């Protein structure tokens, strides 16, 4: 199934940044601000949402 990945890169579709990618782009003191927009998804310490 190694022959279908240049097909995936052949279309110029860009993926939107998912939640777990926009949850790493913050420093630890900016994470507690309202500028951190991924605060409404971090709910459980064991489980992700």
């Amino acid at each position: 199934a190694a022959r279908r990945i240049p097909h995936f890169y052949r279309v110029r579709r860009e993926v939107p940044r998912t939640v777990n990618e926009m949850k790493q782009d913050f420093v630890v003191t900016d994470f507690y601000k309202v500028g951190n927009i991924t605060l409404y998804t971090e709910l459980h310490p064991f489980f992700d949402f």
């Binding site: 993926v15 998912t18 777990n20 990618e21 949850k23 790493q24 064991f46 992700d48």
Partner: protein
């Protein structure tokens, strides 16, 4: 691309992109592989982790 159906998610790459190259960072990637289970919590407690 199932970052919400795999084991090793995006913080693993996000730290290891900019880690210093010592054996201690190999141990950092070893120790963040600690699972979150109740038995893991009791045994991490029992030896002062």
């Amino acid at each position: 691309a199932h970052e919400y159906h795999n084991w090793l998610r995006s913080p693993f790459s996000r730290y290891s992109a900019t880690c210093p190259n010592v054996l201690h960072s190999v141990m950092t990637l070893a120790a963040m592989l600690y699972k979150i289970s109740p038995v893991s919590l009791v045994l991490q407690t029992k030896a002062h982790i």
